[PDB]
Amino acid sequence: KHKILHRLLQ
Amino acid sequence: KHKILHRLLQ
Amino acid sequence: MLSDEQMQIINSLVEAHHKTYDDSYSDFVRFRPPVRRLSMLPHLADLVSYSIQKVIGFAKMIPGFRDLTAEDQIALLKSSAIEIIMLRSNQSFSLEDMSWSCGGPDFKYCINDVTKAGHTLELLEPLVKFQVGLKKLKLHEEEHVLLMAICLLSPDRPGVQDHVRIEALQDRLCDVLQAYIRIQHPGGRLLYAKMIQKLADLRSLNEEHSKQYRSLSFQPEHSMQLTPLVLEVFGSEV
Amino acid sequence: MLSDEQMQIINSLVEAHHKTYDDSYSDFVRFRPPVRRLSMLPHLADLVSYSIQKVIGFAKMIPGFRDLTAEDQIALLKSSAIEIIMLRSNQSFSLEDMSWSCGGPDFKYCINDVTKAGHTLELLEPLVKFQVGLKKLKLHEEEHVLLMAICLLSPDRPGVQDHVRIEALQDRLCDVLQAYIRIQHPGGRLLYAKMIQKLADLRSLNEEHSKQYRSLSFQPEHSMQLTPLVLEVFGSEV
Ligand SMILES: C=C1/C(=C\C=C2/CCC[C@]3(C)[C@@H](C(CCCC(C)(C)O)CCCC(C)(C)O)CC[C@@H]23)C[C@@H](O)C[C@@H]1O
Ligand SMILES: C=C1/C(=C\C=C2/CCC[C@]3(C)[C@@H](C(CCCC(C)(C)O)CCCC(C)(C)O)CC[C@@H]23)C[C@@H](O)C[C@@H]1O
Q1: What family is reported (chains A, B)?
Q2: Which of residues 1-10 of A touch D (CB under 8 A)?
Q3: Helix%, strand%, coil% for chain A, nearest 5
Q4: CA closest to B9 among chain D residues
Q5: In the 8-state DSSP scheme, what is residue C101?
Q6: N or C: more exposed end of chain A, with fewer CB within 10 A?
Q7: Which CATH architecture has domain C1-238?
Q8: 3-class DSSP state for residue D190?
Q9: How many CB atoms lie within 10 A of CB C105?
Q10: End-to-end CA distance of chain D
Q11: Please, which contacts does C35-41 make with residues 24 or more away whose CB atoms are closer than 8 Å?
Q12: Could you tell me which of C46, C51, C54, C50 has the C-alpha nearest to residue C17?
C-alpha cells in the first residue's frame, strides 16, 4: 500500500 | 475487507 | 383494501425512514465545512458518508433484509447505496431553485458545487432531470419509502447470491406499493409504472457515478479526501 | 563559528518550518468541528492528518532526505510522524494553562479532550510532562527545527534499509546543532544533552501511542472516524 504517502512525497 | 459495513450491520 | 401484513410493512418502513432522516439537517454542521481543486469534495464526502450510515440504518429495518446473509446484505448495499442516496435526497430538492436546500447559503447545494467535488456538468444534468421528474410525482411518504426499499432489494446486483430470495422479498414490497396506490392514492393509474421507470434511470445514474468515482478514487490526492466508509462501499474489493 | 554548509542547513530548515507551520492556526476551521463516544476523535483525527501532510512537507526539505529511497522515506515518516507531531505541537503548548492553545474555546486543547479521542489519563500525563519540560528549554527556532530533523533521521526505525546513510545524515545535523548551541546560544552547556534526552522520551511516547492507537484502530466503529492518511501512516501494512 502506501499510495497516499508515495503521492505526497511527490 | 468490508470491516466497517460488517460492523454497521451489527 | 390492504391486508394486515402489508400494512405492517408500511408502518415499519415509514418509521425506519423517520428514524434515519432529519428534515432540519442539523447534523451537517459536524461535516468538514463546504468551500465554494475540488474544494467541495471534503464536505460532500462527509455528506455521502453520513448518508450511507443512514441508508444502512433504514435497510436494517426493511422487513426480510435482516434475514439475508451478511454477504448479500453487503452486496445490495454496495451496489444500491448511491441510488438510495439520490432517492432520499429528493426530499431536500427544490424545483424552485433547482438545488438541494438543507440550510442557509452553506448547505444549499447547486449543480455547480457538485462540480467542485470532481463531477462534470454533462452527468450532473441527468441527476437534476431525475430529481425534477421524481419531485413532480408528488409521492406520498408511504410511496417514497416503499420505492427506496424496492430499489434496495433489486435482485439484479453484482455480487448477490440468494437472488431468488431477494427477488421474492422485492416482489412482496412491489405488491404493497401497487395495492397502496390503488386504494389510497386518488388519481394514480400511471404512477406505479412511472415509479418503476425511475428505478431504471437510477441504474444509469449509478453506472455514471461509478465511472466518475473510479477516476477520482484512483488519484491518491483525491481519495485521501474521502472517508473510510465511502472508500469501502464504493471500493471494488470483492 | 559555523561554516557555510552548516549555515545553509539552518536556513533550509527554518524556511521549511515557516512554510509548514502557521502560528495563527487558521486552517483548523476546515477540520470536522470538535465536540466536548470519543466525540473529539473526528476533530483530532483531522488535526493529526493535517499535521502529517505538514511533516511530510517539512521532511521533503530536510537536506539529504530527498535523496533517500522512497521506501526509507516512507519508513522514517511512518515511525517518526507522531514524534514530530508532538515536537512541533510544543509551539502551541502553554505552561500557563497546560494546554495547546490554537484558538478560542474551540481550538484550545485540554488533556481532557484527548481523552474523548480514545486516550487515557495515565498516558496523557507523560505527554504534558514532555511538553512542559521541552518548553522550559526555551529553544531558539533554529534548535527546534534542528531537533525535529534529527528525530526524523533516526536510523533506529523499523523498516529502514540504508541505515548507514540515514545514520550519516543525522550525524551531520547533530553537528550543526552542537556547533550552533556552542557559538550562538549563550548559557547552553547542557542544552544539547538535554535535547538528545528528549528524543528518548519521544520513543516511549511513541510506543505508548502505538498501543493506544492499535486498540482504537481495530474497532471499525472508531477507525471509520479516522482519515485515509492517518490509517496509512499508522497502519501496519509492510
Ligand atoms: C445526500 C443527501 C442530500 C443531497 C444530495 C446530493 C447533493 C450533493 C451531491 C450528491 C451527494 C450526488 C453525487 C455523489 C457524490 C459523491 C462522490 C463520492 C464525490 O462521488 C453524484 C454522482 C451522480 C452523477 C450522475 C451526477 O455523476 C448524489 C445525490 C447529490 C441532502 C439530504 O437530502 C440527505 C441526502 O441523503
Ligand atoms: C498536532 C498539533 C497540535 C497539538 C497537539 C496535540 C493536542 C491534541 C492531541 C495530540 C494530537 C497527541 C495525541 C495523538 C492522537 C491521535 C490518534 C490518531 C487519535 O491516536 C497523542 C498520543 C500520545 C500519548 C502518549 C498521549 O498516548 C499528540 C500531540 C497532541 C496543534 C498545533 O501546534 C499543530 C501541531 O502539529
Answers
A1: Belongs to the SRC/p160 nuclear receptor coactivator family.
A2: 1-6, 8-10
A3: 60, 0, 40
A4: D221
A5: E
A6: C
A7: Orthogonal Bundle (1.10)
A8: coil
A9: 7
A10: 44
A11: C35/C116, C35/D30, C36/C112, C36/C113, C36/C116, C37/C221, C38/C116, C38/C117, C38/C118, C38/C222, C38/C225, C39/C116, C40/C113, C40/C114, C40/C115, C40/C116, C40/C117, C41/C116, C41/C117, C41/C118, C41/C222, C41/C225, C41/C226
A12: C54
Query: In Å, what is the CA distance from C232 to each residue of C198, C229, D16, D100, D188?
Result: 26, 5, 36, 34, 53
CA D42–ligand 2 middle distance (angstroms): 13
The answer to whether B4 contacts C232, with C-beta atoms less than 8 Å apart, is yes
Please give the number of the atom of ligand 2 that sits closest to the Cα of D118: 19
CA distance D212 to D218: 10
DSSP state string for C118-187: T--HHHHHHHHHHHHHHHTT---HHHHHHHHHHHHT-S--TT-S-HHHHHHHHHHHHHHHHHHHHHH-TT
Which grid cell sits at D103? 484558538
Beta-carbon contacts of residue C5 (< 8 Å; ≥ 6 apart): none
D109 phi and psi angles, rounded to 5 deg: -105, 110
Cβ pair B5:C232 closer than 8 A: yes
CA C39 to chain centre: 24
Exposure string over C195-217, b if 16+ CB within 10 A, otherwise e = beebeebbbebeebbeeebeebb
- Is residue D217 within a helix (H) or strand (E), and if so which, with residue range? helix D191-218
Q: Give chain D's length.
A: 238
Q: What kind of experiment solved this structure?
A: X-ray
Q: What is the largest CA-CA distance in chain D?
A: 56
The set of chains that have 3 or more CB pairs under 8 A with D is A, B, C
- Domain ranges across chain C: 1-238
Phi, psi of D87 (to 5 degrees): -70, -50
Residues 6+ apart with CB under 8 A from D232: A1, A2, A3, A4, A5
